[PDB]
Amino acid sequence: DLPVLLTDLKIQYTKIFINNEWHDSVSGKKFPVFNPATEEELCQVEEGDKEDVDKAVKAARQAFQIGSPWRTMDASERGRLLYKLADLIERDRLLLATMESMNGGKLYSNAYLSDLAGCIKTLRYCAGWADKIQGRTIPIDGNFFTYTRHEPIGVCGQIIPWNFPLVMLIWKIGPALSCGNTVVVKPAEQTPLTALHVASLIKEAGFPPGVVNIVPGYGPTAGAAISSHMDIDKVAFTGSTEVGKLIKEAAGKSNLKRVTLELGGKSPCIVLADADLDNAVEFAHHGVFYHQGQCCIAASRIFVEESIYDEFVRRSVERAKKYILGNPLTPGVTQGPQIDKEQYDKILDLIESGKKEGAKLECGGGPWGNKGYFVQPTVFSNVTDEMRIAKEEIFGPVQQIMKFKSLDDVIKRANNTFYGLSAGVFTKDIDKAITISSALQAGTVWVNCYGVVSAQCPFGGFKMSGNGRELGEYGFHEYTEVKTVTVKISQKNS
Amino acid sequence: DLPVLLTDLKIQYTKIFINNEWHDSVSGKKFPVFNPATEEELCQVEEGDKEDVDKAVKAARQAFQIGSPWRTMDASERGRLLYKLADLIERDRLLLATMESMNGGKLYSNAYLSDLAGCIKTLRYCAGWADKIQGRTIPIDGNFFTYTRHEPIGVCGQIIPWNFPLVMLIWKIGPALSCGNTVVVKPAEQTPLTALHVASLIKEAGFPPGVVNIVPGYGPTAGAAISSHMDIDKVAFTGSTEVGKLIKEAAGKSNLKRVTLELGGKSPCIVLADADLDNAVEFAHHGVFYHQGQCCIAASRIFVEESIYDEFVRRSVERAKKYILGNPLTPGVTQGPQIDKEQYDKILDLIESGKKEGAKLECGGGPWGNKGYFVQPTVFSNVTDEMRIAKEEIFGPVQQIMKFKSLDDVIKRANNTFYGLSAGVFTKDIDKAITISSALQAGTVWVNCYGVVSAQCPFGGFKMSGNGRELGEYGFHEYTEVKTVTVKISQKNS
Amino acid sequence: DLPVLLTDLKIQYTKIFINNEWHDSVSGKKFPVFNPATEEELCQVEEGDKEDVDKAVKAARQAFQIGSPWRTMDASERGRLLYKLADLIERDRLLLATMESMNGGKLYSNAYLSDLAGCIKTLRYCAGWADKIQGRTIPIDGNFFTYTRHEPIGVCGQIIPWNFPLVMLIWKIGPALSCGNTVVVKPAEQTPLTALHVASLIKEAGFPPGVVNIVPGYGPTAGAAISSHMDIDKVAFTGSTEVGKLIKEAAGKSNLKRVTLELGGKSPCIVLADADLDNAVEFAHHGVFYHQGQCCIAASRIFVEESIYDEFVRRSVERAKKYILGNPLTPGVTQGPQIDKEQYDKILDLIESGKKEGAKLECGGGPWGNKGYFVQPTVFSNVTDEMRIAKEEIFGPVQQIMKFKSLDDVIKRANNTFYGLSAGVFTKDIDKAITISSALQAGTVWVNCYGVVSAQCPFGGFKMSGNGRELGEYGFHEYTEVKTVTVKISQKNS
Amino acid sequence: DLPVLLTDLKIQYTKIFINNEWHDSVSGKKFPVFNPATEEELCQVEEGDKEDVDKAVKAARQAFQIGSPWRTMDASERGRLLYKLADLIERDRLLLATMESMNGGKLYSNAYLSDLAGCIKTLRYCAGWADKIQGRTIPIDGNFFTYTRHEPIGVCGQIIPWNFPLVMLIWKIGPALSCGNTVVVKPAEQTPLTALHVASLIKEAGFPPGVVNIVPGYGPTAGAAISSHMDIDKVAFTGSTEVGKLIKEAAGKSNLKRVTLELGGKSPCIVLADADLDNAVEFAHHGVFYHQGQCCIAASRIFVEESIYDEFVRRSVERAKKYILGNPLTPGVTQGPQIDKEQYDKILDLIESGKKEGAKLECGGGPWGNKGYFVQPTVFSNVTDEMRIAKEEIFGPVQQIMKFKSLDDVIKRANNTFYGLSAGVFTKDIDKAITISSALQAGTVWVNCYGVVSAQCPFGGFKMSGNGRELGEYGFHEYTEVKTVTVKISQKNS
C-alpha cells in the first residue's frame, strides 16, 4: 500500500539530449514506445543514428577539453552535482516510478521501493568517491620522484538494456561522472523515456553542457555507431552475449576503445541437505522470478540434494502458483508482462523445448491473457544438464530444479557453462560455504541468500558473463586512465 | 625432518651491538644467562644501561641522516638486505634453533619448525613491502597538486620479551627496516643470545652501520632509557600490561614518541553445541598449553555449552596428562620449563588460588622435578568469573574450563575484561561464527581454530591488550610518518 | 560585502548535551563566556566536571552497545546523517558565523567564508567515507580464510581549542562518527557556544541519543576526567604541547586509551632567490598573521636568501601596517582581538624578549586600544636562531624574518626544533622544491603557498607537533580498530 | 669493460615446453633463428601451431584445476619460486646476456646491465606481491557480510615481441604467476631462444608442470591460435597496433577473453627554453636511439622552443655521429643491427619519405655495411606535423626535431595522434612541468628525463598505444578476477 501518482502521468521529454538541450533526429524519423501491459503506444521518441551520435560525441569531447569547466571543476563539486541529482530523482520519485512501471512493465511497488531507491543510493555512493579517487607515489629505483594520476578516460559510450532502465543508467553515469568522464548514453529502444526525464534533471542540477548526452535509438544503428566510433575512448555495455561479441569486435576494428561488458548468465544455485529450506526456497524463487525473471542474475539452474529434492520442488511450485498476472500499476498484481513480443516468443519457445526434451512440467508452462505479453510462472523438475532450458538463458518466469548427490560433481556441473555471472550456495556449514563459493566460477556468490546487489559491492561476471566490474571501489578503476609521472631529482631520500 | 646440531653449541656473541660492531658495557658490568631447564649458567652478556642506549640512539640517528646510505638506498635494495638476512638465518637455522631452545627453554622441534620458520617467512614478507609502501595523490579542492609521502619515522626503540625472542625480534625489525627506519633493539634480560647472533648476520648481510643496534640489559635500566629518550621517535613494546603503562607514561613526559604496545591477554574460547569437539578440544588445548602456556594469545577461559561441558572436560584432561616434562633438547620431551623462578612462583601462586577459591582440580596442580622450573600441566573445571584464575593472566600451563547456557551472556562474560588480545569461536553455523566474532572485543578471532598467526595477517589487541597492529599491510602503517606536499599550480585538470 | 544577520543574535543553547537532551551541571556551577573584542559577558554555560563526563561516557557506551541503532544502522545511513547535519549547518550559516565571530573574536568574513565553508565541506567529505571504510581479505599461509574488519573503536573523548572552535569540532566528530564511533566532546572554556548550537542540529538531524555528547567545562577538570577515564577507548586532543604530554601521561595511567595529538608548531618558511616574491611575501604574511596569528600552522620563522632579504622585509612591513584593529563584526576591520588575557600577556611578553634580545623591530611591537585584547601587527627582522621569538610558539600577530645563504644549512636550521607541524617552500625550481620538501621534517609542506588545508588531504605533525593524522584517507585509520578473523577450512584455493 | 662468457656459447633448448618437458612440433616442422648482425643461422627451433597450443592450453588448464598444487600452494610459496627463478637467472646471467645479444642484436653491455638486471629486479618485485594480493570486506547495506577475493583469472595467453625478449617475458609471467595464473607464452619468431632457456630454469626452480608453457612459432599461426582459443581466459599482447586490433577482434569472436595490449607509440618530447639543454639533448637522444630506436617508448617527435631550436639540433647531430656500427658482441661497438630485413626495409622506406617530403637531413640517412641489417643513425630537422616521419612509428635509429613557439599549441600537436604511450617534458618551472604533464595524453610522462621504466611504476598507454597497465600495484589488477561473496547474517554490527 504505497503512494501513487496523484495526477495522471503526461510524458514530456521525448527527444535527443546533447549539450543540455533537446535536439531532433537528424533523419527526422521517430520510433514508438509501448506499454508492454496494454500494448498501447505511449508516445514516439526521436530516432537517433550515427549523425546524432557524432554530434553527442563532439559535445562530450568538447566538454572534456583541458581547461573546460568539467576538468577544472573540483572533485568535491563533481560529487555535489551527483548528490543534487540524487535529490532531484528523489523529488520526482513518483513520476519516475510510475513512468518506469508503465514503460518497463515493472511492478510499481518494486519500481518505487527497489529501482528508485537503488538510483538514489548509488548516485550518493558515487558522489562520495568523486574526491577520493587517489593515485599513488611510488618509491621507484634511482634518483626519481614518481607519482600516478587516476585521470578520467574521456568520452564513454554507454549502452543500457530494458530490464532496469533507471538503475542500469545510474550504474553507468554514476561512476563515470564521479571519475570526471563525459558520457554518451544510448538507452534501450524499448525504454528510453525514464532516461530522458533524468536528462532534464541533469540540466537542472547544473552539469556543464556536453558532460551527459543521451541518444535514444535502435541497437544496430545507434549502438553500432558508438561501438565503432573513432573518438570514443571507452564503451560500457549491458545486454545479450550475442551483441557483446559485436561490441568488442567493433572496438577492435575502430580505435581499441576500452570495454566493460555485463552480459547475461545461467546462474546456478546449490542447496545442500543442511539448509534452511524456507530460506533457500524463498531466495531461489525470488532469484529466478524477480521482474518476470528478466534479470541477468536469474537463478536458472537450481541443484538440490536428493534427500530434500522432492520437498524443495513441492514448496517451489505452491509459491509459484500464488501470482496474479495483470497491469503492474494495478494494486494487487504480483506479476507483470515481458518487455516485448520478441522475449515473449523466445520464452514460450524454450518452455516448449522443456516439454519436448521431456522435463517434468510442475506448474505453468503457457501464455496468459488476450492483451499484454504475459507468461505463466512455469516450473520444471527432473531437468538434465543437456536440456535447452538448462543451458540457454531464458530471461522469463521459468524455474529449473535439478537434483544432485555428489558435492564435487554438482560444482563441476555448475561451472560447466560459458556463463558465470553469479551463483547461490545454501548451507549452514562454514567450511562448505567458503570452499564451494571459492570453487564456483561466478562473479558474485550469495550464501544463504540471492540477488543481494548493493552500490558498495563490485558486481561483474566470470568468463562470457562480463568483461569488468561496475560498482564498489573496483568498479571505479575501469572509468579511469592511470598516468605515471616520473620526475628526475638530484638526490632521493626515503 | 628434525636434524639436531651435530657439534656442541658454543656461544660467541655476548656484547652490545652499535654501528655493526661489538661494544662493551660503559659501566663494564655483565649479567648472566641461564638455561631454564638445567639452571646452569650459559654465559654472561654485557649489561646495557642509559649510556649504552645513548650511544645506540646517536648511531641510529646518524644512520637516519638525510643523504645517508640508508635513506638514499633504493626501497628495493632495503628489501634485498632483509631477504639476504632471511637466507643467513635459514643457513644458521640449527644454530639458532638450538640456542633458542637452550636459552628460552623452548621445545627444539617447535623452535626449529615454528620459530625459525616464522622468522624467515616474516623477514621475506617484510622484504616484499619495502618497495610497495606507496603514498597517495589527493584530488584536493583549488588549483593545487597534493601528494603524500609515507616516509619512515626515524629512530625506533624496540623492546622484546623472552617467550619468543627470535620471532618477536623479526616482528619489530622486519617492518621497521622495510619502511626505512633505524632501530635500537633491547632484548629481554633472560634471552639476549639469539638476538645477538642475528646482529652478526645483519652485519654480514651488509646493512649500513647504525641501522640496527642491539643493547642487551635489564628492563628498568635500559628499557626505561629507551621509553624516555629525547631523540627516539617511536617505541615498540611487547610485555606485561604493568610495564606498558610505564612506557606510555614515560613517552608522555619525554618527547611524545609514538607507541605500539602488544600486551598480554585473558583470551577466551566459546565452544557451542554444534562443534567438532575433537577440533575444539585439540585447538583449545594447544591454545593454552603451547610453549608451557607462555603465549600472549593463551586460551585462558574456555566457555562450553552445558550439553557438551562434561565431555569436553573429560577429553581436555586425558590430553593434558600425556606430557613428558624434561630437557627441551630431548626430541620426545613434549613440555619444557618456565623461563625463570619469577614466573614459576607466580604460576604456582595462581594454581593455589584456584584450589583456595574452590575450583575443581582435574589434573596437575603442582611443580615437577628437583632441577629446572617445571610446572605440571594443570586443568581446572567448574571455574567462576570472579576467580583469580579466571581474571589474571597466568602465563603458565594452566587451563580453565567454564560452562555457559545463554549465548548472549557468555559473549558479555568473554568481553567483560580489560584485556582483549584474541578469542576462539568453535561452531559449524556460519551466522553464529560471523555474529559472535563481530561481537567479541578481540584483536584476532579464530573460528574452529586457535593460535593461527602468520606474517600476512595484522595482529594486535583491543582495550588493554595493545595499542597497535604489528603485521600485514596495516602493521607497516605504524612504522611510517605521512608527509603531505601541496603544490600551487596555475590551473588544475582532472 | 557579505550578508550579515538580519535579526540580533540571541544565545539559547548553554547547557551540557547528553543523550540528545540538555542537562545541567551536576555541581550546578556555571562559567561565563565573554566577547574578546568588547570584554562583555555574553552568557554563562553549565560548568562540566567528572560527574558530567561520567554521565556522557555512559551514554556513549550505551549508544555503542552491540545491537544498538548506531551499530546496526547501515554505513550509508551514518553518512546520510552527517550529510544532513552539513545541510543544517549551511542553513544556520549566518547564525553560526555571527556567533563564532562574537565568541572567538574572529573576522566575520573569515568566519563565514572559511570556517563555515570548511565545516560543510569536511562533514560532506566525511559522509562519503562512511560506507567506504573497507577491510581486507589476506591470502594467509595454510588452509585458512582470513579477513579483517575495520570496526569503530568505541567511546572517543575529543578535546578542542578556541582558535577554530567549529572547524576543529567537525575534524573530530566528522571522521569519528563516519567510522561508527560515539564521541564525548569537550569544547574550550572560552568558546563552547558554537559547539552547543551544533549539538541541537545533531538532535534535529536524527542522530541516535548518546552518539554525540558535549560537556563544556574547564581543562584541568573536564579535560582531565576524559584523559584518565577508564571506559574511554580513545582521546583526541588539539592544543598546547604542555597539555598534550599530560593527556598521553594520563592515558598511560588509566586504560592505555588511544591518542591523537595535534599540537602547536614553529613552522618555518624557506624563500629561495628564484621565487615569485609577491607570492612568497603574501602567503608568508597570510601564514603568520591569519586569525591574529592564532594558528597551529603559523609561519613563525621565515628564512630568506641574502639577495632578496632586504626587499622581502620591506614588503612584509608595508603589508603589515595596512591593518585596522577593532570589533570583528564591524565592517572594514581587518584584524581582531586575542582570545583572552592569558594569550594577550604571553604575546606581549615574547615581543619584549624580541627587543631585549636585540631583534630589529620593523613595525608594531606593542598593545592597542583601551578595551579588548588587541595586539599591534608586529614584524621582527635580523632574528637569530637562539632567540625566544625564534624558538617558542607565539600564537599572536608577530612575524620573524631571518636570512640564510647556504641551502643545506637553513634546512638543518628549519628542522632544528622539537616542533614540526608544517613548513613553506618558495622556489621555481622543481628539483629544489621536491628535495627541500623531502628533507624538511614537517607534517604538511606547502610549495609556493601556505596554510592550504582541505578535507581531502591528511593533516598532522612530525615530532612534538602531533601523534597522528586527522583528515583524508589516513585520518580515518585512527578512528578504527582492526579485527582479524581467521577461519579454518578443509582446502584452500587461490 | 664487462665480464664476457669464458666458454663459447652453445645453444641447447630449442623445443616446445609443455608440462615442464620438451615436446617436438606436432607438424614436425622447424623454423630457423639468425643472428641479425652476421645473418648467420644459429639453430632451428620447433615450429608451434594450433595443435601445439591446444596441448599447452590443456596443460595450463590442468595445472589451474581446483585442488592442483598451484592453486592449493601458499601465496608466499608462489613468490618463493619466483624469487628462486630470479636467482637462477642471475646465475646464468652471462649465458643469457650473450644469447640475448646474439639473437636480439642487442649491445652486450645493455643486455647484461639493463635487460638481465631488469629481469631479476622485476621477478623479485613480483615475488613480493604474491602474498599481498588482498581483497576487501565491504560494509554493505542490509544484514549481510560481504567480502571479495582477488582470484587468478586462469589460463593466460602471452605474446611477446623481439625488441626486449627477456624483459618482456618477465613482465608477462612475473605478475601472472604471482597472482596464481597459468600461462601459455608464445615468444617472437625471431627471438625464442632466450625464453626457452628460462623455461629450463622454471623447471629447475620447481614450478608445478603446466604452470608455465612456451610454444615458439609464427604470429599468424601460433599467435592467432592463442587469440581465438576457447579455453584461454586472457590474452596479453605486446607488438604492432596492426596486430593488436586482430587480437581484440579474435577475442570478441572466440570467448570474450580479457585483453591487455602494449602497442607502439609516436611518443613526443617538449623542451622549453628554461631547460638543462645537455640533460634534454642527452635523454632525448637516448630516448629515440636506444637499442637502435627499437623501443615502444621512442622519442620520435622532439618539439623545441624557437630560441634553443638551432642549438638543440646542433648538439643532437654531433652526438649521433659518435656511433660505431658492428657486431654487438664486439667491444667498442656502440650501435647494433635491426632485428630482420622487414624492419630494415621499413626504416629505410620512412627515411626516404623524410627526404622526399622535404625534411632537412642533418646526418645519417642511409644503410651501412655489406653484412647485417645496419641503419646509419639518422637525424631530421625542420620536420612538419603532416610528414610520414612525424606520424608513423619508425622503430629505427631516426630522430625528428621540430620547433614550436606557443606552449598551448605544441601540447595539442603532441596529443594530436592516435598513439599515446609516453612523453617527455624538459623544464625547470614546476607549474609548467605539472600542468604540461597533466595535459599530455600519455601513459608515462617523464620530467627532465626519458625512458625511465622500473618494476614498481605502472607502465601502459593512452588511446591506441595500449589497453592496460603491466607493472606496479595496478599491473597486477589485470591478472586477477574479483569474486564477491555476500553472506546473509542475522544481525550486522559496524
Ligand SMILES: NC(=O)C1=CN([C@@H]2O[C@H](COP(=O)(O)OP(=O)(O)OC[C@H]3O[C@@H](n4cnc5c(N)ncnc54)[C@H](O)[C@@H]3O)[C@@H](O)[C@H]2O)C=CC1
Ligand atoms: N595549539 C594551541 O591551540 C595552543 C594552545 N594554547 C592555549 O593557551 C592556553 C594555555 O592553557 P592550557 O590549560 O594549557 O590549555 P590547552 O592548551 O589544553 O587548551 C586547549 C583546550 O584543551 C582543554 N584543556 C586545557 N587544559 C587541559 C588539561 N589540563 N587537561 C585536559 N584538557 C585540557 C581545554 O578545553 C582547552 O580549551 C589554552 O587556552 C590553550 O588553548 C597556547 C599555545 C598553543
